[PDB]
């Protein structure tokens, strides 16, 4: 069982017999959400030395993240009011960016590799695009489903397999991230499990047994890239989707 690293264990506990209060209780998932919140709080509270203008070396990091997500959501929705949807496009980044660096620490735990939470967050953003689009643009919201000047005898086909791609968008956006984080962690644990039993046979294998160690180091080098790039790709697709929902093509 190489997948035991994702087990959810209850720690602080709470129960009753009147009402099902077992929904909220401090758990491994919940404790790592508390840790994510305290890290994100720590990146801005004690980072700023006594509210100085000059912005010490720690604040350049949270300066660059801010600027690379402003200049990304200005180039996507880019209309009359792009900044009204900027806090959500930033707080969808920082959760995924911090929750995929915390998960790299060896005896730790991936928030992002729970499909039930990430798929739920994706369905929340998809319904919050459809409701916002219907509210802002009435019955002509469905004009999104015809591409451009197209010949009329093939328009209903191009409507059906446009709407099918419109509600595949509900689960695709989440399952991309879930699949990347889950496959990366499962790859690292399985190769560690193979190189461990590689190094317990006869003593000639601990000699020149440095090359599988170097391969695992190279995969860990790759895994930060595949963890930060997904945190960026989430925040670019849910900027493009707000471009479609707010502005009709």
């Amino acid at each position: 069982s190489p997948l035991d690293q994702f087990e959810i264990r209850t720690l602080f506990g709470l129960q009753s017999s009147f009402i099902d209060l077992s929904c909220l209780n401090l758990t491994t998932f919940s404790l790592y959400t508390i840790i994510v919140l305290l890290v994100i709080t720590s990146l801005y509270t004690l980072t700023n030395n006594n509210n100085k203008i000059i912005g010490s070396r720690w604040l350049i990091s949270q300066e660059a993240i801010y600027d690379t997500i402003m200049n990304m959501t200005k180039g996507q929705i880019g209309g009359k009011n792009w900044g009204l949807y900027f806090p959500m496009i930033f707080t969808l980044f920082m959760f995924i960016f911090i929750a995929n660096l915390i998960s790299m620490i060896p005896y730790s735990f991936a928030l992002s590799a729970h499909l039930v939470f990430i798929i739920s967050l994706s369905i929340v953003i998809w319904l919050g695009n459809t409701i916002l689009g219907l509210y802002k643009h009435g019955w002509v919201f469905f004009s999104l489903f015809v591409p451009a000047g197209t010949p009329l005898p093939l328009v209903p086909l191009l409507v059906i397999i446009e709407t099918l791609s419109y509600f595949a968008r509900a689960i695709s956006l989440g399952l991309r991230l879930g699949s990347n984080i889950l496959a990366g962690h499962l790859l690292m644990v399985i190769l560690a499990g193979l190189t461990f039993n590689f190094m317990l046979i006869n003593l000639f294998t601990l000699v020149f047994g440095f090359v599988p160690l170097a391969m695992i180091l190279a995969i860990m080098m790759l895994e930060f890239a595949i963890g930060i790039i997904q945190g960026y790709v989430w925040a670019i697709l849910t900027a493009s989707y707000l471009k479609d929902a707010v502005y009709l093509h």
Binding site: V146, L152, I160
Partner: peptide
């Protein structure tokens, strides 16, 4: 901005196909 049978130019046509496949 289509023109079906020289009638009034239809709105976007997208709702009617969904309504046809809805009742099935």
């Amino acid at each position: 901005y289509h023109f079906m049978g020289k009638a009034i130019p239809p709105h976007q046509l997208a709702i009617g196909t969904l309504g046809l496949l809805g009742l099935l």
